[PDB]
């Protein structure tokens, strides 16, 4: 919680604040239908929202997930966008459409 | 008596609420999608009931014509083609908002059995009868689904209220019972530390004095 | 705790030690209603419950407020009974069974 003025631009990269914070709310917006299974499924519900499910699945998988691999921030980046890549942008949307734009 | 342990249990009763709290919470809106959606429905099922209620209601009129004294006859002299009655065939949806039977009466209501088109009004006006069969079921099953979609809605907040309304801090007022006592309990320790403290020092007062 | 020094005639009104306890009861008749309202609908109900109900409603910032009014058992005990009227004045019966025309 601290690490505003760690973040940072070109230096550390501008987009990781905005793209973390994609993922951030994308995360734990998924982790909210993660459970409502016995409800109507998770197949009864809408597409979009459903999305967020698919966000988590390849979270866990390929994000978090990661063996003993030595990753890179770089490589770290590339994922984001991946599992992003389930989702029209339209909700991506703390990032410009330059950025996804460039990222996708 | 039944009361707490007193004790370590705490924790447990403090993941209490880990369980309670948070999951309990969104249920709430979840359905509210359904009910919100389930009015589309509602709205439509009346839409050309109505209307064709009044274009059922040509016929119903159009019997007294020269046939309302011909409704006598026809009582008897249109009626069975088809059998009357039943035909409903019950019908799960099966959902949140568990099953309650819906159901089409799949049967026909019928309308022709008879030669000629015989007395005329009949016929057509026998159609007519389609036009009540037919169109009834949109709203003999939508409002199979208002039924439950009342059920929900109501249990639901019975519940939201129950959680809301007594559980969570009936289980707080507990914890810091429980809390107090054990700390509490660091005094009494000191209380006799202090006093311990006051041999080895009196020990040590008059045996290095004395 | 005291309630029964500087009770009675010859040191009261009539009602004073009354009307007490028919407030007191009164209000009570309410509340349980109030409870019960959203968590059983609308539904149950007579009209002598829309009545304990009414006499709830009544009882509140009419009653209970008075600002800074500097009140006398009289300037109370009048808009006390006027609550009682709202009510079936024969389903008063913390009172004699004439009060209800003793005051109305």
New interface residues.
């Given amino acids: 919680r601290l690490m505003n003025n760690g973040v940072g631009k070109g230096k550390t990269r501008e987009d990781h604040k905005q793209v973390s914070d994609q993922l951030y709310s994308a995360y734990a917006n998924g982790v909210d239908i993660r459970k409502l299974v016995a409800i109507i499924g998770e197949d009864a519900l809408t597409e979009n929202d459903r999305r967020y499910l698919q966000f988590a699945d390849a979270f866990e998988r390929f994000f978090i997930n990661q063996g003993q691999q030595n990753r890179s921030i770089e490589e770290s980046l590339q994922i984001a966008w991946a599992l992003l890549s389930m989702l029209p942008q339209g909700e991506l949307k703390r990032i410009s459409k330059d950025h996804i734009g460039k990222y996708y | 008596s039944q009361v707490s342990p007193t004790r370590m249990n705490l924790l447990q009763r403090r993941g209490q609420l880990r369980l309670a709290q948070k999951?309990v919470d969104?249920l709430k809106k979840?359905?509210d999608a359904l009910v919100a959606e389930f009015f589309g429905l509602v709205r439509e099922a009346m839409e050309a009931r109505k209307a064709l209620d009044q274009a059922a209601k040509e016929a119903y009129a159009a019997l007294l014509l020269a046939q309302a004294f011909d409704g006598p006859e026809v009582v008897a002299g249109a009626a069975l083609g088809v059998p009357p009655l039943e035909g409903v065939e019950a019908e799960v949806e099966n959902?949140?908002g568990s099953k309650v039977p819906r159901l089409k009466a799949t049967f026909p209501d019928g309308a022709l059995l008879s030669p000629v088109g015989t007395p005329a009004y009949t016929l057509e006006a026998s159609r007519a009868f389609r036009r009540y069969a037919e169109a009834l079921i949109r709203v003999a099953n939508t409002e199979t689904r208002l039924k439950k979609i009342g059920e929900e809605i109501?249990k639901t907040?019975?519940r939201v209220?129950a959680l809301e309304q007594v559980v969570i801090p009936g289980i707080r007022a507990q914890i810091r019972f429980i809390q107090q006592v054990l700390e509490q309990r660091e005094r009494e320790d000191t209380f006799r530390l202090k006093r311990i403290k006051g041999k080895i020092e009196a020990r040590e007062a008059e045996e290095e004095g004395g």
């Fill in positions: 999951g969104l979840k359905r959902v949140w109501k907040t019975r209220n």
